[PDB]
């Protein structure tokens, strides 16, 4: 059955630290402990090892990513911008 | 302790050797003025320097 109405993963913190702080850390912890689909082997085994380090158990590929998510939106926009400036730089 | 260095063991050896009573014939000597070994040490009364 459903065990918690709204706290979900931050039910381990009990009543402590304040509702808003628990809500703020809930999505961060969900993304932190989630398993992402590896972009090299295609298996959903790419999980965080330490902060910023993401390791796939299947192909043993280690990727430098965000603190809590596999890639940050900042880095994605940066990669797109660098691609555009590369294709602009050459002709 | 059971573990010890050579210098410590030698120091304890000397302290053992010089902790004995005077010979009995010392009191027979001319002008003795010595009655007993006043430097006798007991392991429980007083502790060594080290």
């Amino acid at each position: 059955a459903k065990r918690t109405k709204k706290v979900g993963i931050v039910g381990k913190y009990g009543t402590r630290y304040g509702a808003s702080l628990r809500k703020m850390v809930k999505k961060i912890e969900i993304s932190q402990h989630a398993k992402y689909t590896c972009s090299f082997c295609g298996k959903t085994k790419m999980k965080r090892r330490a902060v910023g380090i993401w390791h796939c158990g299947s192909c043993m590929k280690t990727v430098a990513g965000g603190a809590w998510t596999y890639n940050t939106t900042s880095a994605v926009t940066v990669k797109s911008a660098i691609r555009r400036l590369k294709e602009l730089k050459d002709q | 302790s059971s573990h010890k260095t050579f210098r410590i063991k030698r120091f304890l050896a000397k302290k053992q050797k010089q902790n004995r009573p005077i010979p009995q014939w010392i009191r027979m000597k001319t002008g003795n003025k010595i009655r007993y070994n006043s430097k006798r040490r007991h392991w429980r009364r007083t502790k060594l320097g080290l």
């Binding site: 913190y13 630290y17 702080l21 703020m24 850390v25 961060i28 090299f40 330490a50 902060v51 910023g52 380090i53 590929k61 280690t62 990727v63 430098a64 990513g65 965000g66 603190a67 809590w68 998510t69 890639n71 940050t72 900042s74 880095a75 940066v78 990669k79 911008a81 660098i82 400036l85 590369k86 602009l88 730089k89 | -």
Partner: protein, 149 residues
């Protein structure tokens, strides 16, 4: 330990003797193991590559920027941070960059930097939530944390 940015262990070939040289680059976000990174003037614009700022376009952003033309990386090293190449002048061989603090700096066109943003993402978004987590955070840095007013 003690920093939020991951470090990259990169192996180069020694150009003058038969040996393997291992470097400890700061991991720009997006790089992975088994990837080739190219360092030098003729390197292309890719995440993880190192090339002088004088050879980069007017809107590119960099990861581990040199304060002086010849030392190793000094700027934008902390996790999530980056500096932006703004303007050039081929004469006087200068380049203007925007630092993470928002200040503008003029540096030599020969300063090298890694393309991309340093990994470690938005580490400061997560509330610490515990005195113990702060204790473990600062135990690996230095003795500064329990701060009496």
């Amino acid at each position: 330990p003690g920093r939020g940015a991951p470090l990259a262990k990169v192996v180069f070939r020694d150009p003058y003797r038969f040996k393997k040289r291992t470097e400890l680059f700061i991991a720009a976000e997006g790089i992975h193991t088994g990837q080739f990174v190219y360092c030098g003037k003729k390197a292309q614009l890719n995440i993880g590559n190192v090339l002088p700022v004088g050879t980069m376009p007017e809107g590119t952003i960099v990861c581990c920027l040199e304060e002086k033309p010849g030392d190793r990386g000094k700027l934008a090293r902390a996790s999530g941070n980056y500096a932006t190449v703004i303007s050039h002048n081929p004469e006087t061989k200068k380049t203007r960059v925007k630092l993470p603090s928002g200040s503008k700096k003029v540096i030599s066109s020969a300063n090298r930097a890694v393309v991309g943003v340093v990994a470690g993402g938005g580490r400061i978004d997560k509330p610490i939530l515990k005195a113990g987590r702060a204790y473990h955070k600062y135990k690996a840095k230095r003795n500064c944390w329990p701060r009496v007013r």
